[PDB]
Amino acid sequence: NLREFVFKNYFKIYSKHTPILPQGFSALEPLVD
Amino acid sequence: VCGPKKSTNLVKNKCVNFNFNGLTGTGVLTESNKKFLPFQQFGRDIADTT
């Protein structure tokens, strides 16, 4: 399992979960504010 | 955080004056086939308008 997160500043969390650091492209989406 | 306003019903396929959470304008409201994501509220055109 590949899990990607963005933790940035208030604080916001973006993430993506895909099956399988591997090369490839996708965009993470906001889940938690 | 919205003001003390009474909401009403939505009229489709006609020219209307709309207000969505304070966002206003004039246009015809029809069913969309846009694939909105769970976190998205509205979309925009190239002119940066709704």
Tab-separated table of C-alpha atoms in Angstrom:
chain	number	residue	atom	x	y	z
A	1	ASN	CA	0.000	0.000	0.000
A	2	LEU	CA	1.267	3.488	-1.024
A	3	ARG	CA	-0.017	6.334	1.072
A	4	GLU	CA	0.772	9.944	0.276
A	5	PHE	CA	0.071	12.956	2.483
A	6	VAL	CA	0.487	16.718	2.472
A	7	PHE	CA	0.718	18.401	5.844
A	8	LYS	CA	0.624	22.168	5.444
A	9	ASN	CA	-0.447	25.466	7.094
A	10	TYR	CA	-4.676	26.825	9.830
A	11	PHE	CA	-3.632	23.163	9.184
A	12	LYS	CA	-4.875	21.115	6.237
A	13	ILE	CA	-4.375	17.456	5.336
A	14	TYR	CA	-4.382	16.149	1.757
A	15	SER	CA	-3.927	12.507	0.816
A	16	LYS	CA	-4.031	9.677	-1.728
A	17	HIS	CA	-4.100	5.870	-1.385
A	18	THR	CA	-3.117	3.545	-4.237
A	19	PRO	CA	-1.996	-0.137	-4.517
A	20	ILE	CA	1.650	-0.943	-5.452
A	21	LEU	CA	9.288	5.467	-3.593
A	22	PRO	CA	7.689	4.377	-7.028
A	23	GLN	CA	7.646	6.730	-10.030
A	24	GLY	CA	4.238	7.937	-11.224
A	25	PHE	CA	1.769	10.814	-11.003
A	26	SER	CA	-1.475	11.521	-9.180
A	27	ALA	CA	-2.966	14.420	-7.244
A	28	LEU	CA	-3.812	14.332	-3.550
A	29	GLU	CA	-7.125	15.689	-2.267
A	30	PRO	CA	-8.065	17.560	0.959
A	31	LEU	CA	-9.788	15.472	3.585
A	32	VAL	CA	-9.293	17.192	6.914
A	33	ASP	CA	-9.419	20.869	7.865
B	1	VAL	CA	-21.973	30.894	8.682
B	2	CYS	CA	-25.141	32.155	6.883
B	3	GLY	CA	-27.575	35.048	7.616
B	4	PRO	CA	-31.217	34.797	8.879
B	5	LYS	CA	-32.762	34.136	5.500
B	6	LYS	CA	-35.614	31.858	4.546
B	7	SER	CA	-34.693	29.354	1.879
B	8	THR	CA	-36.959	28.417	-1.000
B	9	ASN	CA	-37.423	25.784	-3.700
B	10	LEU	CA	-35.292	25.579	-6.821
B	11	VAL	CA	-36.753	26.148	-10.273
B	12	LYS	CA	-35.088	24.263	-13.122
B	13	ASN	CA	-34.896	24.891	-16.890
B	14	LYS	CA	-35.944	28.548	-16.635
B	15	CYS	CA	-34.131	31.924	-16.503
B	16	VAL	CA	-33.770	32.702	-12.764
B	17	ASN	CA	-32.144	35.001	-10.223
B	18	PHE	CA	-30.175	32.686	-7.936
B	19	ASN	CA	-28.377	32.927	-4.580
B	20	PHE	CA	-26.221	30.025	-3.372
B	21	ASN	CA	-24.629	30.804	0.009
B	22	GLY	CA	-24.371	34.495	-0.926
B	23	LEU	CA	-23.145	33.732	-4.470
B	24	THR	CA	-25.499	35.491	-6.837
B	25	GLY	CA	-26.161	35.838	-10.537
B	26	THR	CA	-28.622	35.333	-13.383
B	27	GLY	CA	-28.851	32.199	-15.500
B	28	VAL	CA	-30.656	28.960	-16.267
B	29	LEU	CA	-30.155	26.079	-13.830
B	30	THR	CA	-29.944	22.603	-15.409
B	31	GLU	CA	-28.664	19.175	-14.377
B	32	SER	CA	-24.880	18.918	-14.659
B	33	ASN	CA	-22.812	15.979	-15.869
B	34	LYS	CA	-19.627	17.311	-14.250
B	35	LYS	CA	-17.686	14.857	-12.142
B	36	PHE	CA	-17.392	16.882	-8.959
B	37	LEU	CA	-15.145	15.538	-6.246
B	38	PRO	CA	-16.470	15.082	-2.618
B	39	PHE	CA	-14.612	18.192	-1.435
B	40	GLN	CA	-15.623	20.562	-4.250
B	41	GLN	CA	-18.362	23.177	-3.816
B	42	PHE	CA	-18.593	24.836	-7.241
B	43	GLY	CA	-16.673	25.033	-10.513
B	44	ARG	CA	-15.387	27.844	-12.735
B	45	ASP	CA	-14.990	28.791	-16.410
B	46	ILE	CA	-11.956	30.330	-18.195
B	47	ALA	CA	-13.282	33.805	-17.287
B	48	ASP	CA	-12.985	32.746	-13.621
B	49	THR	CA	-16.759	32.913	-13.226
B	50	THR	CA	-19.033	30.238	-11.806
